[PDB]
Design a protein around this ligand. Structure first.
Ligand SMILES: Nc1c(C(=O)c2cccc(OC3CCNCC3)c2)cnn1-c1ccc(F)cc1
Length: 338
């Protein structure tokens, strides 16, 4: 065991190994608070997230486990991975705190828009990397479910990583089928989000800034068109079906008339991502081979993930059971080679 040391940072205590120095709060992350730190062992800047009350309830305990499991599995250039996980606890009985260490990125996609002027070549590169990372997480039956600018982190290099996958305004980037639970969903819910993000990088404006679920759907159908007969057949919910057919019918628009002056190939890909029918929406693997990414696409360097075991998701266990499983995962963690 290494040597630990303590401090207060904005009304919360952090006990970390001595190898991490110059802790400096950066804000709120998923279920916790994150610090920038310096990693004396590797000379790298890192991000340390302290989970908040990790084992306070069954929900928290299961989610703490889930987050650690997911992060330990991700080994890909465009997905955030685990550099280190630690606790100040010497045994399972005093185990109450979890700290997760990853690379520190420079900004999120939200930040970098209003800072620098995004050319077409930048949008090509950023969306390419998102899709490359989505191919990887999807290949392991993991779905992000809440892809949005604030969980896309990027360096000054323009190198991008996806954060906060597998854990789930947020509503602005949600696929209509999971927001409304109106038809069966799959991995392509994330492709809907990618389309919304790509539209935003090209226009500088949110594509669908709805004030609630109904206004949101309204803004969407104004662009994509109300579902015809072939889509309505696939809607299992009676109430959802009745809302769609009771609305005043909207035509599908010409995306060229909406995304005026955008690269025509970019507009073509948007048209393929922003379809309501999830069985027809382009996948990440198909998207990577679209002509829009000709400059970046390499099929021998778009790898898939090892099998991921999420059978734990269907299980109902006690707090101390989830806690013990997490403890094992902390103990068994082997860091990456540097
Ligand atoms: N690695 C990061 C960041 C970042 O690196 C990040 C994200 C957005 C912006 C950002 O820039 C900072 C540095 C300079 N600008 C302001 C904050 C870093 C944020 N959260 N996490 C994280 C996720 C899971 C974990 F287990 C641990 C940490």
């Amino acid at each position: 065991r290494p040597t630990f040391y303590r401090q207060e940072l904005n009304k919360t205590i952090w006990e970390v190994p001595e190898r991490y120095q110059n802790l400096s709060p950066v804000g709120s992350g998923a279920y916790g608070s994150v610090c920038a730190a310096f990693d004396t062992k590797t000379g790298l800047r890192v991000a340390v997230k302290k989970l908040s009350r990790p084992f306070q309830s069954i929900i928290h305990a299961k989610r703490t486990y889930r987050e650690l499991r997911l992060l330990k599995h991700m080994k890909h250039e465009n997905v955030i991975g685990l550099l280190d996980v630690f606790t100040p606890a010497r045994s399972l009985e005093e185990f109450n705190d979890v700290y997760l260490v990853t690379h520190l990125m420079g900004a999120d996609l939200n930040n970098i828009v209003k800072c620098q002027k995004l050319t077409d070549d930048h949008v090509q590169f950023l969306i390419y990397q998102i899709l490359r990372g989505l191919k990887y997480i999807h290949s392991a039956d993991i779905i992000h479910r809440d892809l949005k600018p604030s969980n896309l982190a990027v360096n000054e290099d323009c190198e991008l990583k996806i954060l906060d996958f597998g854990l789930a305004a947020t509503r602005w980037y949600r696929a209509p089928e999971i927001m409304l639970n109106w038809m069966h969903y799959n991995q392509t819910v994330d492709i809907w989000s990618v389309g919304c993000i790509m539209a935003e990088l090209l226009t500088g404006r949110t594509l669908f800034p709805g004030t609630d679920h109904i206004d949101q759907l309204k803004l969407i159908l104004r662009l994509v068109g109300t579902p015809g007969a072939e889509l309505l057949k696939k809607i299992s919910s009676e109430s959802a079906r009745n809302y769609i057919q009771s609305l005043t019918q909207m035509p599908k628009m010409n995306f060229a008339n909406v995304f005026i002056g955008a690269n025509p190939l970019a507009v073509d890909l948007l048209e393929k991502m922003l379809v309501l029918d999830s069985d027809k929406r382009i996948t990440a693997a198909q998207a990577l081979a679209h002509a829009y990414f000709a400059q970046y696409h390499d099929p021998d360097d778009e790898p898939v993930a090892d099998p991921y075991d999420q059978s734990f998701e269907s299980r109902d266990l006690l707090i101390d059971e989830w806690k013990s499983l997490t403890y094992d995962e902390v103990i068994s963690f082997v860091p990456p080679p540097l």
